[PDB]
From a paper:
Here, we describe the chemical synthesis and folding of a central, cysteine-rich domain of the cell-surface receptor tumor necrosis factor 1 which is integral to binding of the cytokine TNF-α, namely, TNFR-1 CRD2. As this central portion of the receptor contains a significant number of TNF-α interface residues,11b we envisioned that it can be synthesized individually and serve as a truncated mimic for the TNFR-1. Cell-surface receptors, responsible for converting external stimuli to cellular responses, are critical targets for physiological investigations as well as diagnostics and therapeutics design.
The racemic TNFR-1 CRD2 mixture was subjected to sparse matrix crystallization screening, and the best crystal-forming condition was identified to contain 25 mg/mL of protein racemate, 1.5 M sodium chloride, and 10% v/v ethanol. The crystal structure was solved at 1.4 Å resolution, confirming the correct disulfide bond patterns with well-defined electron density. Consequently, this indicated that the TNFR-1 CRD2 is structurally conserved, and its binding to TNF-α suggested that it can serve as a receptor mimic for further investigations.
Residue numbers in the entry: 72 to 116
The structure:
């Protein structure tokens, strides 16, 4: 499966899933991340 970005974490799609890379998710330029676990992060203003 390709991954989806977590809207409830405020994530946006950066790059789409290709044959050789999963979906890349991130935040907007003025935000920063908090990692709740290795994989799960949230975007804050």
């Amino acid at each position: 499966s390709c991954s989806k970005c977590r809207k409830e974490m405020g994530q946006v799609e950066i790059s789409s899933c290709t044959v050789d890379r999963d979906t890349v998710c991130g935040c907007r330029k003025n935000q920063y991340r908090h990692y709740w676990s290795e994989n799960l992060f949230q975007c804050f203003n």
